[PDB]
């Protein structure tokens, strides 16, 4: 890491370097700063309403609340020690604040302990199979806490129900509240009750003094919807002032990228939010704060070549930053069509090619 000649020696794994041009590393322009453009929505998400509502629903009839168009703080939930289970699948529990979700679905109910692990994708069991199902590709956080402090009234609380019998396995994210009498086999129910005509509906009857496994549990399942829809459930991160014509790290409604943001002549249709190239790379973005179209140009990069005569001849080297303007590069500096050449003196005279640099340009050790 001392000088370009040492980079050449380490690249070749040789203490002696022959005359020629050698690519040793890759110049990359680094981002000066990170800029954030989230939508200014001060309205807090109703996590307060869903986490300590007066009454939660039964598992067989799980209550779904749609969360959208609000700033969401998952840090306050993670910091609270009340929750016993905070299992996040497809997302990181710490990273939840930075993410922007197109939708959120909070599913609130009450279950027992022995089936807390039933609510997780690819699980089986009575509550898992006939009460609440999670798809294998489910993305979101299951948050369970013990609340027998206000769950089980003395003498048994039979308010919350569960469906222990059903015709078929519940479909993922599907609710079945039907109380049609189930025919288990030989004897047809004919729509009436009797022997082997097991009714789907069953009752908990939590006692305040049951085993911890048998005790009530309040569970909220947050499902994060991350389609190509616009991201509306964003974190509380402060939006920063927009910076143009400078290689920056940017965040536009959950689209993160490193690039130079320039004023775009592209005139998006009013519903359009992003732009893409023939290769489906992000080409243009729309500022959330002001309806401005911005071209995203990737930060200047390219190979670094070392023009050297043999270490027999000299330790002097020139450096070619390939396809880089002589402004991005951090005493002769000469702009060629092959890139920026530093440490080589431009000479008007034409000679036979010695070290081929690029588009008609060659280098040599002389005088």
């Amino acid at each position: 890491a001392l000088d370009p000649l040492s980079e050449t020696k380490c690249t070749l794994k040789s203490f002696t370097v022959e005359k020629g041009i050698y690519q040793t590393s890759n110049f990359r322009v680094q981002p000066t700063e990170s800029i954030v453009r989230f939508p200014n929505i001060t309205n807090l998400c109703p996590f307060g309403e869903v986490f300590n509502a007066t009454r939660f629903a039964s598992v067989y009839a799980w209550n779904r609340k749609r969360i959208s168009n609000c700033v969401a703080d998952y840090s306050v939930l993670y910091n609270s020690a009340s929750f016993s289970t905070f299992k996040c699948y497809g997302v990181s529990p710490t990273k939840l604040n930075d993410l922007c979700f197109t939708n959120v679905y909070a599913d609130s109910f009450v279950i027992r302990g022995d089936e807390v692990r039933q609510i997780a994708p690819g699980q089986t069991g009575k509550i898992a199979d006939y009460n609440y199902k999670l798809p294998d590709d489910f993305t979101g956080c299951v948050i369970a806490w013990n609340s027998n402090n206000l769950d089980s009234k003395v003498g048994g609380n039979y308010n919350y129900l569960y469906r222990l019998f059903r015709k078929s396995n519940l479909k993922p994210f599907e609710r079945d509240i039907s109380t049609e009498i189930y025919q288990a086999g030989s004897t047809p129910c004919n729509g009436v009750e009797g022997f082997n005509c097991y009714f789907p509906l069953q009752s908990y009857g939590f006692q305040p003094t049951n085993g911890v496994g048998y005790q009530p549990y309040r569970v909220v399942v947050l499902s994060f919807e991350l389609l190509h829809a616009p991201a509306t459930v964003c974190g509380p991160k402060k939006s920063t002032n927009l910076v143009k014509n400078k290689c920056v790290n940017f965040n536009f409604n959950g689209l993160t990228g490193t690039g130079v943001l320039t004023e775009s002549n592209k005139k998006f249709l009013p519903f359009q939010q992003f732009g893409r190239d023939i290769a489906d790379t992000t080409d243009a973005v729309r500022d959330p704060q002001t309806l401005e179209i911005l071209d995203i140009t990737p930060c200047s990069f390219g190979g670094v070549s070392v023009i050297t005569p043999g270490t027999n001849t000299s330790n002097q080297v020139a450096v070619l930053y390939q396809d880089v303007n002589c402004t991005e590069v951090p005493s002769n500096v000469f702009q060629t069509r092959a890139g920026c050449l530093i440490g080589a003196e431009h000479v008007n005279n034409s000679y036979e090619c010695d070290i081929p640099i690029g588009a008609g340009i060659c280098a040599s050790y002389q005088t």
Partner: nanobody
Amino acid sequence: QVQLVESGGGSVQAGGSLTLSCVASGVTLGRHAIGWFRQAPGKERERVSCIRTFDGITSYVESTKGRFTISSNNAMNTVYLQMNSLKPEDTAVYFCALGVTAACSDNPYFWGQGTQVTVSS
């Protein structure tokens, strides 16, 4: 098929306490009304108590009110009958009784073996 395995009872002093346990297999408590019946000597079938496992409501008779407490823990598939303040008139064989209906009023169709409770004056 359904089994009603019973336990507890035996001999006890008049005014003492006992606990009867009934555990159901092949069925789950949670809707089916489960209760306790008894046979006193020279007496027919009579209800002692019942609990609606769908709602937890309990029904008794004149002879068993207050002295006997029925309680269903549907989670362990268990029903308990606690005798307190026993009398020699309570010397009876107790049957665990189950229905295919939510109502305790409906006659049980589903019987356990039976446990003898003897009360000594």
